[PDB]
Amino acid sequence: EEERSKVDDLRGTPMSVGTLEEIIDDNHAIVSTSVGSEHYVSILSFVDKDLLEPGCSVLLNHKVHAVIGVLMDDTDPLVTVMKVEKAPQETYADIGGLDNQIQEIKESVELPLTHPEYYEEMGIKPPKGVILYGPPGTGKTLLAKAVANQTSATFLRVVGSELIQKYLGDGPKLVRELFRVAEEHAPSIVFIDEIDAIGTKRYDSNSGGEREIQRTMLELLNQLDGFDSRGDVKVIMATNRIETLDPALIRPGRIDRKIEFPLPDEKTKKRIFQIHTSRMTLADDVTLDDLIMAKDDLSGADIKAICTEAGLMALRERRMKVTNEDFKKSKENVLYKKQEGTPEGLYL
Amino acid sequence: MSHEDPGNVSYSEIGGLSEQIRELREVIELPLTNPELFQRVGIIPPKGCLLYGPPGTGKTLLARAVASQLDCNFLKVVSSSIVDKYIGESARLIREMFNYARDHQPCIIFMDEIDAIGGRRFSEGTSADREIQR
Amino acid sequence: IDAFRLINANMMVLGHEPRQTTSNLGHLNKPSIQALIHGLNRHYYSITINYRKNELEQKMLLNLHKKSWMEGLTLQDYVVKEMLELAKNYNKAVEEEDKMTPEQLAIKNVGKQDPKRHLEEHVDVLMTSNIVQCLAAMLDTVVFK
Amino acid sequence: DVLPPEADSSIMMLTSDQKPDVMYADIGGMDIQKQEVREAVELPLTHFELYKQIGIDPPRGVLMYGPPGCGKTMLAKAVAHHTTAAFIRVVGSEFVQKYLGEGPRMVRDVFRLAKENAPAIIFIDEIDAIATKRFDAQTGADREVQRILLELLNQMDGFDQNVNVKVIMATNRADTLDPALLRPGRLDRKIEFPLPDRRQKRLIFSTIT
Amino acid sequence: LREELQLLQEQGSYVGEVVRAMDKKKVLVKVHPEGKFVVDVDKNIDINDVTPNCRVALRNDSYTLHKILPNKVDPLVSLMMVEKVPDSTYEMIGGLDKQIKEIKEVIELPVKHPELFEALGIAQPKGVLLYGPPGTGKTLLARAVAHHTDCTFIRVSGSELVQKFIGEGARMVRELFVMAREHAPSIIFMDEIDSIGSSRLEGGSGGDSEVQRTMLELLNQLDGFEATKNIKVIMATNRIDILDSALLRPGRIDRKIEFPPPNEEARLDILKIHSRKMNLTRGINLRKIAELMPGASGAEVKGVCTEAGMYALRERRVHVTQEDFEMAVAKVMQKDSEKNMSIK
Amino acid sequence: GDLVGVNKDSYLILETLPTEYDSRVKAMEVDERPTEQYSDIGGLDKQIQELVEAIVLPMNHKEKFENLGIQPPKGVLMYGPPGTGKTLLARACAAQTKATFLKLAGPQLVQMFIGDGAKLVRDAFALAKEKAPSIIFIDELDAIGTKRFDSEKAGDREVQRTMLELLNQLDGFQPNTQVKVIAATNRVDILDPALLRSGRLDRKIEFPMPNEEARARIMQIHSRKMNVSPDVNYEELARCTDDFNGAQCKAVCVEAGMIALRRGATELTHEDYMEGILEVQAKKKANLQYYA
Amino acid sequence: APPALWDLAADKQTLQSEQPLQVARCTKIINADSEDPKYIINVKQFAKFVVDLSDQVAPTDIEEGMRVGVDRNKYQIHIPLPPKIDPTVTMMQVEEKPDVTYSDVGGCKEQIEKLREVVETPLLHPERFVNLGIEPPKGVLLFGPPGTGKTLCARAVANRTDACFIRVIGSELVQKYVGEGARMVRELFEMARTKKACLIFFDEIDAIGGARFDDGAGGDNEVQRTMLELINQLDGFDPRGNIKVLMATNRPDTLDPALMRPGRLDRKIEFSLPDLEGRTHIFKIHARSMSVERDIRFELLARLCPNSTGAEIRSVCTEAGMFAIRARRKIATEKDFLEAVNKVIKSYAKFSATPRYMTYN
Ligand SMILES: Nc1ncnc2c1ncn2[C@@H]1O[C@H](COP(=O)(O)OP(=O)(O)OP(=O)(O)O)[C@@H](O)[C@H]1O
């Protein structure tokens, strides 16, 4: 009605927006525009003052630096990194041969959320997540086990995060300010993959520095301790060594378990290569026997592109069709060997 | 120039070493009174000196005595003024200190306790080691 | 300058749009003088300013100003040849740099963006430059006989 | 209307031509160093028609390092007494100021005097101060001046090829230097000042006597 | 113009930057020296038309949006790139004929030919690398990637200004990968991060380990989950790193390219190309001059052309004599390795 | 100077207003008097007088010093294994000297920015010269006084230069002979050799572990307020105290104040002192078990 | 919407108060007084404000080091504003919600009685009045094996009269550069003196003590800032503090706060850690969790896994329900014998996996 038409000229038109400093029990509001300003605003309604909290942005009318009403904008650079999204088209069934290993991590993350009936009647409740890692280059393949968790509720894919090493925030509350904004939109999962904080030997380049940078990484160490860790906000860590975390951090969590990704054997190589070629039809002239037999202890990704490097040179001969000229050139890549290497060298 | 010190007399009061008493009187006072010895023989007089401690005393006593006795011609530097203030510029102070050193002649400059402000660039701590290098 | 008059804010119940004789009202509304000035048109209204005839003194205002501004007596000013050496520098050194562009007008032909007119404004400057030096040389034959 | 343009308030340039500075009679590198310096330093001054015949780029790059002995600025003052030239006498750390906006003007005006007029040899002593790469944002005054060093590192690529420029450079630490500095394509000539050892003793004792 | 100057007169017409758009009808406006301000309608530019990270003209009265101006993110990126890389068309480098032979479909096949990937029922490779003793191509391999692939040159650190421009800092696992999505046929190159500083294998293989882990995590992406193709990596090898790259990538997974040492047929083509910019006599034999330079590299052949051009410059002649090329070889033979102490 | 009023666009200074500068650097903390007294200690009688002398002698005897040409001491060091009671004891000396007490500490001289420590020390002496001779006490000077070996850098290096600037103020500045400053450290492990002077540290006292009779006297003055069970021989409690610090003595004193009501554990009497005496370093347990 | 409607129409009365209360800016701390009517105030504009006061505020309400308002028209003081709370770093360090309650086990042998008699029971003063004093010691110290610590503070909240004490962690003192701990301990204790008997807690020195340093610089001298000023502020004359203190740690580190406290603080304890009958009491409250009856024999396997505290056996009863859902079972007595089957395999797998043949070999 006439409400919106009457009060639109009170705040604007060219109004400025500052930041709320503190809240007084006398109803006087102190707003700070950038930079170094104060004011007294008395408003008894439209608040919503509890959801605000200090250190937030509020409107300021031109006459005179007063707030017509408060809104929730942005909020903060950290909340934006959750989207988007992920929830891809991939599922946990798209990989195989790890079914015995994946049933431990899949059932642990599916214990909350779906099937809550036996979760609430228990009233203990291990919502600790897991910790992932493995050779030679894996540990993001264990993230492919979380692609089913990515499709479950809200997911956050994180490698090295952002604010950890680059520039610090204020306290552990950054994850906890994510927890309070998630509690409306919950559940959620926050992944951790390949931490580069301690992974780098020589940091780039010379900084403030060889000592203190360890102390601002120690800020991350206490940020994950944490005060006070209660709910989820699931935490799944992936990195080389877990020993970077102090035993004082394990006391709040997470004490559940950590798994390692073993080298997939010939039964797993053929299964991983089969499901990728299941939905999207393969070629009949290329046999899967000589591919898995000629290799020993290799991932599912490595068996894939050795057939691509054959199709790589194939287009130089200008063949989109399946041609037997590549069959020998692919068998030549089997005779080329070189798939695996590792020391050794000794006779034992 | 707000500093001060008695002597004069405190020059010869320390008593030793006799070779350091006579030499510091030469390298300082002789270029002032007799530049002819440098230009006629064709030798460069020393433009600087270093007095370090504390294997004994006489650093601040003997040098500042000639300073205070030289009256309006002198320059004093405390190690606390090099760090100056947050995002402060002491690079123009070093250029100014030697600029006025070329005005008043012969000027004499005292820099004491340089271990903190003489920072090496081998190990560079935080953000504050580079401004020492500047 | 500027002119304004406060209109009563209690008139909000009545109409806000006088006055008659739209001639000086429409001319005063333009140019509209930026924004914040018209943003202050709330509670205010401008007013037109005209000059009743001062021409008695306004005739001497032009006379007293120009009589003292012409050579101070009109005599006293009659940098001369030294400025001609500076002028012939602006009549030569500036000429060759301005006459390279007609060579740039020929491409040839035609790969460069056209048309481009390099004639002005230095050509008329050289016109007045010789008009100055010729009428300045007349000072010899004017004052003398 | 813009400036001519000019060097504005930066540096300030010249101040080398007041004279004298250091006589080359002490050490000029007779018949040994004056050879490598001839082709790679004072020939690039102009020598325009000769470079088109050979087709080889005589890059501006002159590197110095490893004091003692001093050398360095003396080699800049030695060429000053050979041919009259306007030298830029600066340090790595002196141009850091309270305003980073002047930075883009500095390297422009410093390198604009080499291309337009060429009795010009630019000398920068101990670049390892700004060569230190500091990540923090509060240090952005240092982060901006190594962009200044990297901006002139780009302006040297805008010169080649070819005419005209010359830049001589000296520093006491080569470890802190960025890899793009000494990367080929920018500095193709690095002359390491040799340790004086025994050979320069009788040479420095001959000039002192 | 005088009337237009009046609109620009009082405070002057500024240039604002919009960091984000709000649903409250107010648009955030950032001035470069000042902080981040905000302004409401602004009825000329609609609310939904306002997009973050763009440039707008700031009015002097209500601080509204006068006009709209584009921003260029890539030209600042490509500035560092073009500083660090030249063009080098296919004829500029020798010994690369076999490289672009089997490396061409690493580039254009995932772009214009998604179908033949499924002919074999297979997906795209995640990158390649070169390994060997120098040799030339430290500059030249990176030189060829820009002209061949027609892709962004985004490179390993890189100082100091690799981390600054993109986000607050470059983690190399996302930003460099996110900027690789902006360009559709984009690959990744890392140069150098191979040298002797760092000949102790600590900093040499330790700093590369993040890239070594980057290429490992890329293998897992196109296996388990990803929406993006054409994402690949190429490495340049200077000293050692032969076995370090062989452990992770023993030709796995891509065409196997060894960093070429100087070779007979390699010195023949690299000399003929670099000699097109010089005036040389026609009584010279390019076969014997290549065989008289064992070892060294193709970059040394360029150094021979420079040294042979300095003495010809001294004699003041338009050409160069092959005898002076021998003088260019005698200058570079004194720097070889060390002797006679330790071994023999 | 500074702090001259300039009004809006008028740009005219009507009056030059005090006092000095600046902000919270001006006044660190305003203290009046301690509650305790120097009579609460024992066994230090000879070594406490060395501290009592140097501070008291310039007050009354300054007129006698001008006759004999004697300079009073300025820097004084107070150190020992804690608790030595130096915190309250050196503070209790400010009540006898009648001079104004100003609380200061090593970490108090440290700030966020650079060069702030040099601003604080020059700020206190400016108020020291104006406020007449006073007493300024600092605690743990060895921490900020650590020059280590190599550099760079120490976190407190700004203060370790300022402490050496204090040595320069006690070297070149004659007015620093006024307003004696008291210093105290936990350990002499790090000590600057340049600290030797009358203006610099002059009287430096090594406080050992109090004597068995001294530990009984200091703990009796603390326990005189509480109500204790009768029949206290004082013979066993003195001998049972060996090597124990004065703070560990108050740990038994604070423990002895809980024995009234119940407590509920039965202390009975005469075993009270030997209880918390053994609490820190004792008790076996083992002895033998798992071993021979 | 009813609050939104009325508020939009309620600002029509606010635009009558529009001009006043605007002048309030800015916040400024006063320094000295030249005369009775006139003071001087340092303001955010970096200058100093020599001001009179309006008739609404008495001259006694303005004291040195106080933040007050102003009216930018007449420049006289408007109203003093005391409150401001924390920087960005320490506002997180404030306690949010209770956690880690001690109701899971009891009672302890000694350490529970050691502290409760020196601090907790005297808080209501059935004892301290007649028993003391000798003003009571201001704090205790918690340390030992990780199980159990800090858990007694949460149960004390339920047993403490109004109002609950705010607890502070000591591992957040390191953010960037140095010197933040200086201003930190100052203002948080100034607020603590206003907390009027509300206790302050400190713990987690082991969270920063994992590595934190390689060679130097430490780690030592820069740490002496916070730790000495803490004790220095703890040694402050007034009050001090009537809010007591609460200290806790894991390892005895470090020595400087350890030997300074006995003159003021007292009653250090050593965990404790569970008991034989203590572990089965944790299974007694855990019988109310999961699905459990009283027919189970707890002491059977309890003696075979010592030094598990309460955290590991909590995970034992946790992973027990994990297999109960996988195996579809419900009540832990059903499942009578086979609950111990998953209890023995999970507990021993959580400790470690080592071959038993090489042990005796
Ligand atoms: N013939 C010579 N041979 C060697 N050194 C000389 C000769 N003549 C003068 N010098 C030295 O060169 C010095 C000045 O040269 P210059 O300004 O280049 O030094 P510098 O390189 O800046 O010193 P540093 O290497 O410490 O930075 C004089 O102090 C002088 O001792």
Ligand SMILES: Nc1ncnc2c1ncn2[C@@H]1O[C@H](COP(=O)(O)OP(=O)(O)OP(=O)(O)O)[C@@H](O)[C@H]1O
């Ligand atoms: N020898 C002693 N005589 C009397 N009282 C003592 C003695 N030693 C300790 N105390 C008492 O113990 C309490 C604790 O103070 P403590 O001795 O720990 O400070 P301190 O060790 O002197 O500090 P610092 O070493 O920093 O000067 C003090 O209140 C003090 O009264």
Ligand SMILES: Nc1ncnc2c1ncn2[C@@H]1O[C@H](COP(=O)(O)OP(=O)(O)OP(=O)(O)O)[C@@H](O)[C@H]1O
């Ligand atoms: N021989 C002396 N005669 C008179 N006064 C002296 C003597 N030596 C030192 N002093 C006094 O000591 C103060 C410091 O003097 P100086 O700098 O020479 O020694 P120092 O470097 O302080 O010695 P240290 O470092 O061992 O304390 C001076 O103010 C001076 O009054």
Ligand SMILES: Nc1ncnc2c1ncn2[C@@H]1O[C@H](COP(=O)(O)OP(=O)(O)OP(=O)(O)O)[C@@H](O)[C@H]1O
């Ligand atoms: N000895 C124990 N007996 C019973 N329960 C325990 C024991 N130790 C720990 N717990 C339980 O573990 C849970 C989590 O404790 P938590 O890990 O937070 O201890 P903490 O605060 O880290 O210990 P500290 O402060 O010593 O580091 C608590 O709810 C508590 O019930």
